[PDB]
Write a protein that binds this ligand. Structure first.
Ligand SMILES: CS(=O)(=O)N1CCC(O)CC1
Ligand SMILES: [Zn+2]
Ligand SMILES: [Zn+2]
Ligand SMILES: [Zn+2]
Length: 459
């Protein structure tokens, strides 16, 4: 049990308006054959064009919503819509392009998929709400065969060129005309009542319906993300390293220890309420403070209501000391808080578009995150950058230009001149901090927080 058997039954009711007379009894084997593809009894890594829900979840970075609408089918032009917002018109002779033959349309499809996916995944998974025309249009831009490698590198082949008779990955496919060995999943097979729009709109008010193929492609991928990452959550699935994952996670741990340690020194809170990950560890283990933990898993649907986290009867007095919400998404933070909140609007290879304004954050694990909302932070202010250190001024063991900065809160800077060690540590921390902010994380703190209160910790 690893791939989707070609002998699995495929429900054809969704296909019968575009394909009247379609047999009710149908397998993936017969559907693939009907789509114009011959699998030739091949044992070469590509057993089925269609994949399971579990395989699709493991390859969520490859998801591209795909829909085809009849503009007027060998006689009529087709509108091809992709969840990237692209609409192409193919003639058989929200970016909307005018009607062109398939030989040029297929060049555009390969360029669009390669640019969207080269930094995300080794493949493409066409996410469908299958009605017929999308499946029958695939022979015009898709080639299949044994699993292959790129002509210029070791990555698996995702494109084919008829001009050169060669294969390429998404990074080396310039000028390629066919999508090679794509994968696909029909959401309609999962068991839904009603059309695409009525199922999508139950969970999402951000994607409308301009009545074009890309709107359906977007709604389709959105509904699939809702089903696989919002109402169903699997934090055990591991995802490959495709970017700055390790550095971002290391920066997050450095910034957390820095900010919390300084808040405790500047305001001397007697108690800290750590609300979030049930597996959390004390980020400042040497601090004097009474550390109390409260379990809350990452919310994937809507942000937690502060009334449910704190009320309904713990120190009980969350108003005492300070509250630490490190990636714990709540509707409205209390005034006495230290907050790290992921901004879902951020553009990155780790952050994929999500459901209802939310985003799918994929860094080792997949975490659907509720929409970033500026009103959650009305009792707080933006945490300003600062570096604090009470370690001894000692080099030990990288060329130098003397550091001058009002935000290097150290004994050496208090005494007029930043030592080499604290300058090296300051620039390293500034790099980690910038990495974290640029990755989408935003930092917020109680209004009375003032770094001027840190200088008297040097007496
Ligand atoms: C995606 S998020 O909300 O920023 N968050 C951080 C990573 C994980 O440990 C919990 C969820
Ligand atoms: Zn390559
Ligand atoms: Zn949506
Ligand atoms: Zn120093």
């Amino acid at each position: 049990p690893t791939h989707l058997s070609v002998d699995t039954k495929f429900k054809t009711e969704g296909l019968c308006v575009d394909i009247p007379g379609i047999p009710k009894d149908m397998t993936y084997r017969r559907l693939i054959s009907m789509m114009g593809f011959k699998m030739n009894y091949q044992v070469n890594g590509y057993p089925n064009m269609f994949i399971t829900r579990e395989e699709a979840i493991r390859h969520v970075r490859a998801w591209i919503g795909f829909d085809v609408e009849g503009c007027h089918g060998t006689n009529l032009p087709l509108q091809l819509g992709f969840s990237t917002g692209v609409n192409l018109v193919a003639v058989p002779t929200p970016l909307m392009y005018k009607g062109l033959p398939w030989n040029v349309v297929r060049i555009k499809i390969v360029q669009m998929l390669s640019d969207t996916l080269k930094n995300l995944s080794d493949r493409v998974v066409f996410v469908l709400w299958a009605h017929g025309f999308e499946l029958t249009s695939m022979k015009y831009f898709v080639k299949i065969g044994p699993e292959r490698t790129c002509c210029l590198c070791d990555r698996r082949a995702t494109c084919f060129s008829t001009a050169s008779d060669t294969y390429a990955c998404w990074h080396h496919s310039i000028g390629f005309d066919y999508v090679y060995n794509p994968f696909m999943i029909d959401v309609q097979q999962w068991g839904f009542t009603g059309n695409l729009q009525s199922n999508h709109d139950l969970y999402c008010q951000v994607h409308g319906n301009a009545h074009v193929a890309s709107c359906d492609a977007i709604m389709t991928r959105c509904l699939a993300v809702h089903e696989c990452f919002v109402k169903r959550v699997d934090w055990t699935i591991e995802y490959p390293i495709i970017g700055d994952e390790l550095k971002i996670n290391a920066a997050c741990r450095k910034v957390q220890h820095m900010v919390v340690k300084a808040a405790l020194l500047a305001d001397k809170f007697p108690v800290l309420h750590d609300i979030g990950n049930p597996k959390a560890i004390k980020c400042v283990p040497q601090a004097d403070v009474e550390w109390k933990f409260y379990d809350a898993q990452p919310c994937s649907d809507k942000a937690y209501k502060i009334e449910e986290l704190f009320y309904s009867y713990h120190s009980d007095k969350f108003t005492d000391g300070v509250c630490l919400f490190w990636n714990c998404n709540v509707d409205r933070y209390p005034a006495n808080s230290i907050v790290c909140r992921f901004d879902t609007r951020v553009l990155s290879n780790l952050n994929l578009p999500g459901c209802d304004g939310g985003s799918l954050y994929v860094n080792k694990h997949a975490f659907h995150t509720p929409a970033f909302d500026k009103s959650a932070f009305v009792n707080l202010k933006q945490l300003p950058f600062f570096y604090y250190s009470d370690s001894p001024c000692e080099s030990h063991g990288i060329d130098y230009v003397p550091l001058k900065s009002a935000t290097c809160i150290t004994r050496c800077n208090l005494g007029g001149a930043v030592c080499r060690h604290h300058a090296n540590e300051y620039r390293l921390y500034l790099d980690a901090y910038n990495m974290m902010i640029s990755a989408g994380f935003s930092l917020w703190v109680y209004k009375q927080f003032d770094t001027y209160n840190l200088w008297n910790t040097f007496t």
